[PDB]
Symmetry: D2
């Protein structure tokens, strides 16, 4: 462990974002796009979190694997992540599956997508391969995980963090020892084992595996020949590494970038619809759990050119009132009440509206005299005049999609089967 080691491992490293793959539990949010390209934060996409942590961690060589509905994703990487110069060892390579006969190849698993592209990744000559799930929201520093991987003399290093046992049936539960060496790993159990001394919580894998380059190539080619295998990192390989005792665990609180050290680390995978809504409006509160006014760990995105947020008087000459809300650029709010809401770019709300705990994805047009409560308005939805959402549960659940918790989702297809011409 030398003094100039913390700086030379990111440069000998290469990150691989398994962007591609939809989130099925997000219903129609991700019907026309990949989960990493779901909008978030007023101006971000989820994959801006798993990319700006590579940059600020020094890892300037990324590999974005994209399968399902990637036009918007690729078009976002193109416009916001193509400032690189390949001559200074940095790049964001897109690795969709390469078709030679109209659908002959198609990425059978998570770990069968790093094996199709294993002739391109060898050419990078990397020693440490970070394996990032980029449909997640976090502010980690992977040059403090890579060290903890190099100090321990590990082959694979799984970033683990504890979560409530109630939600630990959707993640990879493990069990460690005094030396943070994984002893028992099981993927997506039906009865998540608890931690020792913490019966109400389980030590879960985040989908962030650091691998020596030599061991990963030798483990996938040793796994690609397995017909029985399901070709996934959690469900096939990490048990294989674990059962040889070459798998260590890296606590996330160590390599988490927070502005308040007294707080707990922030991890939201935006699993269902409810946690997507809840995760945006936790940017609109007074004290957000996620700091985005931070200049020591900024998040890079498509810096679209939009005019200032305009607030104008309604048809009656009256004021427009706002409370704990975000209004991004392009918006035009004509004298209506906006509360606990998040308006993204280009949202044009007309007069006399009432908007409460809403999330208005971009290019939404809200017509005159609309009332919106606890809803998610999808991209380009042209809400008609006098529409009421979030006051009649037996109404909203027979028009739009309504989650068990009360969250409504509105899409153009939902609003075009109702008869509202939404071709504006």
């Amino acid at each position: 462990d030398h003094l100039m080691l913390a700086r030379q491992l990111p440069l000998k490293s290469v990150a691989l974002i398994l962007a591609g793959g939809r989130g099925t539990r997000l219903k129609d949010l991700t019907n026309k796009r990949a989960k990493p390209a779901v909008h978030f934060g007023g101006k971000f996409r989820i994959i801006d979190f798993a990319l700006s942590n590579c940059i600020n961690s020094g890892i300037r060589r990324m590999g974005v694997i994209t399968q399902y509905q990637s036009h918007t994703l690729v078009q976002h990487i193109q416009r916001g992540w193509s400032f690189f110069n390949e001559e200074m060892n940095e790049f964001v390579d897109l690795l969709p599956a390469q078709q030679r006969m109209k659908g002959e190849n198609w990425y059978r698993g998570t770990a069968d997508a790093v094996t199709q592209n294993l002739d391109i990744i060898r050419r990078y000559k990397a020693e440490y391969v970070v394996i990032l799930a980029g449909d997640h929201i976090y502010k980690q520093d992977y040059s403090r995980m890579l060290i903890d991987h190099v100090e321990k003399g590990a082959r694979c290093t799984v970033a683990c963090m504890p979560v409530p046992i109630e939600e630990a049936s959707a993640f990879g539960v493990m069990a460690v020892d005094e030396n943070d060496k994984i002893i028992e790993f099981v993927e997506k159990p039906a009865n998540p084992p608890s931690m020792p001394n913490d019966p109400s919580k389980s030590l879960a894998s985040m989908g962030i595996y650091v691998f020596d380059a030599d061991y990963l190539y030798e483990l996938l080619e040793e796994d690609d020949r397995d017909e029985n295998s399901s070709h996934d990192f959690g469900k096939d390989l990490i048990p294989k590494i674990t059962e040889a005792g070459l798998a260590y665990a890296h606590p996330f609180p160590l390599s988490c970038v927070q502005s308040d050290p007294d707080a707990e680390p922030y991890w939201r995978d935006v699993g269902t619809l409810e946690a997507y809504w809840k995760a945006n409006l936790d940017l609109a509160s007074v004290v957000p759990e996620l700091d985005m006014y931070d200049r020591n760990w900024p998040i890079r995105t498509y810096n679209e050119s939009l005019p200032p947020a305009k607030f104008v008087q309604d048809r009656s000459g009256s004021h427009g009132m706002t409370l704990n809300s975000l209004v991004s650029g392009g918006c035009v709010i004509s004298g209506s009440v906006v509360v606990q809401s998040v308006l993204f770019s280009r949202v044009r709300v007309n007069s006399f509206c009432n908007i409460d705990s809403a999330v208005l994805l971009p290019e939404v047009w809200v017509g005159r005299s609309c009332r919106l409560r606890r809803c998610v308005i999808d991209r380009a939805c042209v809400i008609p005049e006098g529409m009421v959402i979030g006051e009649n549960a037996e109404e909203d659940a027979r028009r739009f999609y309504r989650s068990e918790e009360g969250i409504v989702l509105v899409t153009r297809e939902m609003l075009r089967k109702l008869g509202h011409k939404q071709e504006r």
Copy 2:
């Protein structure tokens, strides 16, 4: 006139924006910046108008002449106008006066700045040279002025537009004939001559001269040797061309880009302080005279990455009310009243403020319980708590600078002198 002559006139052409110039009528606004680099519109600088008209007119070769306090200007061109490629015949040159032998070189006049850089401009190999004053705000199409210049068989074409005879003592008044050939030109008269049939208005030069390049080079070298010359385009050259009868006039309403054809063309040179303030708030009204939500003639600028505009509750849990205002990105408005105002980037207003007909240039901090009206807050001004501006004119004259019209201007040096340290 060939049918394919409109599209290859902007490629044989080269624009020269005379960015340098104090614009002394602005008093303290331009103390630390050049007149072009004054902030405008929530996110623009005035030189984004004289540059985005060259782009959308096809003129991709520009030459920005900068002398006085150009650090902010040059830093703006570097970060928002350096997307060009030199192998596609397009660039944004910066031609500030070349310095050797302990600060020897400085331009004697407007036209003694286009001469020193006459060895670099000949390299461009440009047939037509557009000469743009870039301290002006307008939406023109120079590929309709170049045609009118090539149809007429003109050598130099002055863009002229009528203005009230009261303000015509600041511009170049001319007189034309039936075939738009300048007969009488006089620069900055003390008694501006009126138009025929319009006694209340004068036909003024805008500062926009299109030149046959073979004539410009021969005219400046024939002028640079003149010992009594003032080395100015209006004060020396344009009378010389006029007196030979080689000077035509191009009406601006023809080559103006406006979304409402029933309206009059828009020209504001932001002369004094009052017309700066009035010009911004004319973006905050309901029907702006200047359209900036126009996609057929967009304005290019520094697309700074800023978070959404955040509105939060005050100390007391209460709402914040807005009326005909622009709130750009980065702003944080803690539950205060904002009316007829324009907040630029990064403006952090604290609780219980009242803001009326104000313009808050970037990085301004308004403290708790401040009242601001009919004022212009300079960049990074840290307004202290309980400050009151625009209610006692006799008490705003001594503390700050107050125009004759009632407009107040606040700078850090004005506030630092009263002992309100501005170190944030």
Copy 3:
């Protein structure tokens, strides 16, 4: 026909490059890449021809359709064609077929690829849709084809140019009248009909169709419902437009950009292997048919950062001799004879080589004492020591691929079945 019309139609236009789709007659040159991504010119790819003609024709909105082996292509557009800003109406959108169920969708035809993406192209709001085959090499101005399309009052406008009847069985042969109105169109005939008064030549379609936006959308939806249709522009639609008499013909000599007006227009589709090799060395001769030292119609590409071309002495201290050859950057030629050749980037040739009428695609390593005549060395081929190519026809045809005209092609797979470790 107004005077400012030549400049306003490219802005109301959108180009669609049918890049996607391999060139089967190129054998193994396009086995790991799409034909638009075939290298050409020492530093270009074929799709830099059908893109730089959109830029210099003012068409800044392109749509690159990519299906077969597009990793290289996409990775080229990302690194050399992503300098655009979407806020000044300009972009290069990549439109690969969007998969929702692992190969469910896959682009059944050339005109069934503009129909899958017909919800994205409507959003561009474009009046004139240029349909460009981008597997071709030419220097055309599409703002002189668009006019000739607007003057004639046409619906569709097929760029046609005469070719020898011998090769006219691979293109779309048509037949026109006095008003350049197509009368008889047949796609890929077995007996190409000749021209009137030129029995030895046929009037052939280039794959460059300009279409009013309103007619194209109504023609593909009216064609997508046809089960009998083969979904192709030539084989299905252009006969349908022709049989209604709405199809005009635009001669290519009019809208061709040449630097010698006495010459004939340059069109090479790089059909077979022989014409690819012939087409590059026609850059190496003394008077190229294709001018690439032209600054009035430059070609934009991935401006890779490479050191100067180094020529060094061989093991014996001797000179290296060159004759009518192109040596791009990165190359290291150790004192060998290079004749009528084209070396791309990074080509390291070792001592005592002899290279004649060769094309060395990038990262090729030629070992010591090699002789190469009339060959095409593919990307990254590690030629071993003492290899001899192009002197024994019955030898080179049993090792590598040898066309009927004598041209040899060398790939890594060909040189790894022969036992030469080529993993360098």
Copy 4:
């Protein structure tokens, strides 16, 4: 010393490259350009060395101080060093002296340039300030000098390296102790003191001072008020820090990046004309002292788009012979002999030339039947037909400039004076 201290020392840091400076020992080379902007290496400028070491050392915040003839320099930074984003904490500022009141401001010395811009540098909020002379050619790692500065608890760390006592009268000679603390510093002595145990060599300052920022600001404001000071870092400040015992020395062989560890570190300041010529041709030899085919420490520059280097046959159909030369892109060499030479971009050599130990800066045209040896041809020089250089020293002294060592220098003004018009 923390294990994560090497990687967050380049982020709390800010580099200041003093680009301005005539470098008068170069005579006519730097007549029209600054010493930093002198061309080097076939494609680089000297300031690409002092900048790519900040990038690859993690220092992404640079401050380029430019005074003398900076148009080419600024135009280079604009086109090759303006890929940075201000929201990711990285930029390349240009801090030329601010001008108001008819050319008033000009820096009195090296250290009176970092003071005027002391209101802009405090905004950076930098703990460590690297002070780089950028008129020098070396491959250093400043994140190994910053650590050595933070281990030692030093305030200011001077990078020192030994040089022959013959040339030690041009640099800052010092004397150190066991713990590398400067005891005696004297700037540009007339009798450079020797090292202990190495009588033939002196321990010289490179011009590379690392500073505690809290100490720099307090040292320049405490120096700017000095009436007898010369306002220089070596001549005024570094003796002041030395005499307090707060000045440590950092050996350059530790923080040098070299591909052959058995070699000595590479430092060439290109002092006179002879060491400029010798320094370039040391790129053309077989084993360069400076490695530029190194991918672990690449040099970033203006990646100009140029065609491949073309070699063609002469008038007579004959070959062109090369020996240990560099031919960059754009060159066209018509069958002539080139030996031990360095041709930059766009050099068009005509037939029957003989070129030996020459350096042809860009856009040079060599005419037919020219003989050139041991000379330096200035940018855009149009050598006429049958010119002979470097065979008659008595006839090259009068026509051009000839050093005492035998090196010739050719400029356009030297050739224009002999009546060889240089207008191409």
